[PDB]
């Protein structure tokens, strides 16, 4: 159980966007070992009136957000920030100063999947 | 007590439902939450068909259901909280809970603000 | 430090005042939380009046502002960001405080990935 | 479920009465928590004089209560243990609600091992 | 690396008998399940007794409590694999029943931690 | 607003310091966190050596400092507690950094019952 939300400048975003899916599911697989049935993702291709970053970022800003269940290593999530971060990279050049990412972990119990709490 | 509803779905889906949806959820809360009937606060979601990725294994009606809450309820009511929100979709809109995901999130209340104080005062 | 601000409101509301509101909030953060003023990242979700549910004692200035930033601060320096948002949206814009709704979401710095490496290093 | 209490006090006033203390804060755990009355947990530390020190405006009575239990339980219901304690406390020995202290220290299912196994098992 | 502080609460005269060799084997799951150094124990004994120390029924007087505390940060499994090591090991040497021990794992915010001098996360 | 301290150390070498580390463990409290100078609530342990497993890179003055608190403080002011508490007791006893050890635990307010009432009342 992951869902990533990301957020991006439309223009930058939508040509990208099905292979960064991939790319992501990829390295959640990888990382983390999903299911490689179980992709969940949601993008949010912005307006330029919507999107705010600072100067010494570009329009290829992206912000990935991941919610997970609580439970993983600190190394385990450092492990994927950092997949994330070089897959991203190797397959669209875009700078790691361009990429941002947010883990947010929720309890189990906080989670209903499939009919029922997460911890049953 | 305050909660927020976020509810995420393919546009197709989620345009027709949203109004009874809302109706719906927000019964769901006043029963389960015993939440005051005046305050609905339900934000929708609707998405493009190349925006949402749901699993392979499931449908076009996958639907996405966060919800932003004060820390303090116990696990039982929140348990019970999802296990009514899967029944009530379900039912309603024939919609399979295989297709349904819900998220909570508890927010202590010093750190939300509500009519110009923090939600612990 | 990191803060992400994210904010909700209705399309004819909130879109003639996005910019000025995103200038607000930055120079709000600037003074409470002593960020650097290159460090803004905002981003704005203005809602078709469908997809917007909120109580009858709030009007259709109703915004929401959701904050996601690095745990450590303490809740009186949270309580003051607050406070201050209230206070200078509304003296701005004349957006009453009961239409101004601040939820603070923390995060360990080590789940926050930036410029390539964990928040924690 | 799981509570474990541990009791601090000046050895003097503690060894008398903690057989009975003891019966006092397992019936308050019962009818507030709904814990069966086979599971009592409870550790004492009869302190000596020179090893405990409290505020000068609280008496030689003063007693310190950690409860250790699973997270999950309401708000609402611990505030109801806490002021369950300090009433029976207070009526059967007479010790003030100024001289007692507790604090409850939650832990999830899975951080605690009992009967072999990790208690979300 | 890691910080790890063991509290362990048993009868004194079951307790009195066996903590020495108790602290090895505790350590010894410590280090094989958690990595931790060699060189790095960290125990406390409390030996209690009768009239301070209330179980159920179903525990017997070998009945023991152990509480770890740590830094936040390791996995679930790596917690569960740490409690059911613990189990096996303390049962296997002094033959006292799964049972009768229990554990109870405090994790701590590295930077709630001053350790020689400094700040757990520096 | 609370905050209890633990002292465990081996009983020939901690008893002989007690009574003016509570001294110096106050002060520190008193300046770094702003309690009231009322408000002491220190216990120690003295450990029998039997009963106390420490490092061979630590001396018998090995102080274990368990300090129990209210949520809500900033991590720069709980840093600077850890920092005051090293130097102070460094300064007065000629124990080394090396061979003091701080533990924090924070506790939510509502977690804790003081003069009757939980302490978020």
């Given at each position: 159980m992951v869902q990533i939300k990301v957020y991006g400048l439309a223009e930058k975003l939508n040509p990208i966007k099905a292979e960064l899916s991939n790319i992501l599911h990829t390295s959640l697989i990888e990382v983390?070992?999903?299911?490689?049935?179980?992709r969940f993702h949601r993008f949010f291709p912005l307006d330029k009136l919507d999107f705010y970053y600072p100067?010494?970022?570009?329009?290829n800003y992206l912000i990935i957000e991941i919610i997970m269940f609580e439970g993983r290593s600190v190394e385990t999530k450092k492990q994927l920030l950092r997949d994330i971060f070089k897959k991203v990279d190797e397959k669209f050049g875009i700078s790691v100063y361009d990429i941002e990412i947010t883990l947010f972990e929720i309890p189990k119990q906080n989670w209903g999947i499939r009919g029922i709490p997460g911890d049953e």
């Open positions: 983390l070992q999903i299911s490689p049935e179980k100067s010494d970022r570009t329009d």
